[PDB]
Amino acid sequence: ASSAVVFKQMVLQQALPMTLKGLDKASELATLTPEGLAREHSRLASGDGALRSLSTALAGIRAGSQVEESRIQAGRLLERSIGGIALQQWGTTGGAASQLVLDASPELRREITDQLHQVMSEVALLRQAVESEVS
Amino acid sequence: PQAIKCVVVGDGAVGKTCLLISYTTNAFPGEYIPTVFDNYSANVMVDGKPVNLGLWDTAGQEDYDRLRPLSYPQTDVFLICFSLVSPASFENVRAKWYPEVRHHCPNTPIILVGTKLDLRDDKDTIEKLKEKKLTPITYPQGLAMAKEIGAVKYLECSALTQRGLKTVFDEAIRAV
Numbered sequence A: 001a002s003s004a005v006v007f008k009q010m011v012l013q014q015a016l017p018m019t020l021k022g023l024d025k026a027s028e029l030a031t032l033t034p035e036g037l038a039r040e041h042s043r044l045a046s047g048d049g050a051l052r053s054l055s056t057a058l059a060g061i062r063a064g065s066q067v068e069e070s071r072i073q074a075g076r077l078l079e080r081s082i083g084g085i086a087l088q089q090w091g092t093t094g095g096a097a098s099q100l101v102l103d104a105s106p107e108l109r110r111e112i113t114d115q116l117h118q119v120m121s122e123v124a125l126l127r128q129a130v131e132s133e134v135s
Numbered sequence B: 001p002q003a004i005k006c007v008v009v010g011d012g013a014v015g016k017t018c019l020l021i022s023y024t025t026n027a028f029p030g031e032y033i034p035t036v037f038d039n040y041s042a043n044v045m046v047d048g049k050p051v052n053l054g055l056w057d058t059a060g061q062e063d064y065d066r067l068r069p070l071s072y073p074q075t076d077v078f079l080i081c082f083s084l085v086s087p088a089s090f091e092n093v094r095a096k097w098y099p100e101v102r103h104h105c106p107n108t109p110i111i112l113v114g115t116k117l118d119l120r121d122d123k124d125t126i127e128k129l130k131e132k133k134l135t136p137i138t139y140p141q142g143l144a145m146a147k148e149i150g151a152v153k154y155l156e157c158s159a160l161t162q163r164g165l166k167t168v169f170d171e172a173i174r175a176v
């Protein structure tokens, strides 16, 4: 059904205000430490943990925003290479990210953590645009 | 061909999307795709009868609680999922999923599905859970929960190895 895509689009647009709440759940990423990363990744990447809430919210914006620029920025964040693995994939367990973080040296964890702090600065910009679209 | 609408709910990361993709495409997802809302379909034969199965994938995070009910109208059967290696997701079947489904659809049949079956025998997974003073959910626990919430069936499956996967949907279909 072509109307099935219309309904899906309507639903995704309806989810926009909700992605903002998901981005709120991602705030601890700004102060995540390399030790915390190793220790908490499985929690951060499951349920509504910060990394999974981040991935899910960004995907919602990428698919539900009616502003092309916001869709592009969300897509760019999701594909951003974090330690060599796309940010999107950091929001799940049982995959490449879980393995990488398990075998990570102190230096790699530091690099990953710093990249995550940097991502949160860009999230602020994307959020400003989305809050504007929602209002 | 009968059209059957099946909606899948449960905590984020229990494996709803992997389970649905593994079944509809016959291959475990190559990468993780966050779910806010999506739907897939499959033409299957159950007991010699052709069926157009409509599958609805949802977001398990509470932030999307207001969105999930939009997938519920005219649902034929619900799959409530929890990860067999996540006791917390199992407890939520009772605390959240069963109540939500029943509140919206009091007469719709429910299949309780335990996911990631392959991990219950996985050494590293068992070890990591022990460090947190946890242990995987056993078949008996799941069966008891199914009876507690009135599920028509309790089934376990692995989207990865596909063990028990086909049965989940044959039974979902047979429940309608």
Ligand SMILES: Nc1nc2c(ncn2[C@@H]2O[C@H](COP(=O)(O)OP(=O)(O)O)[C@@H](O)[C@H]2O)c(=O)[nH]1
Binding pocket: A092, A093, A094, A095, B010, B011, B012, B013, B014, B015, B016, B017, B018, B019, B032, B033, B035, B060, B115, B116, B117, B118, B119, B157, B158, B159, B160, B161
């Ligand atoms: N070993 C194993 N991992 C699984 C299985 N199903 C899912 N997973 C893993 O768990 C993650 C979360 O699954 P996903 O389907 O995205 O969760 P949901 O859609 O939010 O319920 C995936 O990224 C997989 O690595 C399974 O049967 N076996």
Ligand SMILES: [Mg+2]
Binding pocket: B016, B017, B018, B033, B034, B035, B057, B058
């Ligand atoms: Mg999903």
Ligand code: NI
Binding pocket: A114, A117
């Ligand atoms: Ni920093």
Ligand code: NI
Binding pocket: B074, B075, B076
């Ligand atoms: Ni019907």
Ligand code: NI
Binding pocket: B103
């Ligand atoms: Ni109500």
